[PDB]
Design a protein around this nucleic acid. Structure first.
Length: 128
DNA sequence: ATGCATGAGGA
DNA sequence: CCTCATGCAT
């Protein structure tokens, strides 16, 4: 398995080469469908180039992007800041903390619950 | 490039 | 409920 440094260098050189070939991020994502039956979105290609995915996600995707390379050659600021503050304190809130913070902050419980799942996921990105 | 979301899968 | 991989919509 690759180091974080391996994946960083791979990402850099993947991006350089995609741009040089004049393909867009969506182009690559689509071609992974066309060529390998594994379609991906522009969002996914973008995150991969920015290392904004988990280490394991990055590792699963790298060989796929490598094959492609080989071949071709809302919530408001008042609310947000507060949400962030609590996260630094309690990153994993109980369904009561959640429902509690939700109404007090005037948001649906489900919007608050998902915000915390996403915030937790971000921290697990190779570069958050 | 990013914010909020879905849904499969698991303790 | 969560983690996780993933993307629609912005």
């Amino acid at each position: 398995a690759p180091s974080s440094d391996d994946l960083e260098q791979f990402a850099k050189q993947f991006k350089q080469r995609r741009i040089k070939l004049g393909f867009t991020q969506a182009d690559v994502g689509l071609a992974l469908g066309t060529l390998y039956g594994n379609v991906f979105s522009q969002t996914t290609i973008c995150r991969f180039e920015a290392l904004q995915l988990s280490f394991k996600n990055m590792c699963k995707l790298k060989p796929l992007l490598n094959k492609w390379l080989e071949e071709t050659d809302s919530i408001e600021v008042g609310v947000k800041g507060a949400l962030e503050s609590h996260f630094l304190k309690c990153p994993k809130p109980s369904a009561h903390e959640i429902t509690g913070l939700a109404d007090s902050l005037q948001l649906e419980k489900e919007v608050v619950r998902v915000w915390f799942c996403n915030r937790r996921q971000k921290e697990k990105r190779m570069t958050p």
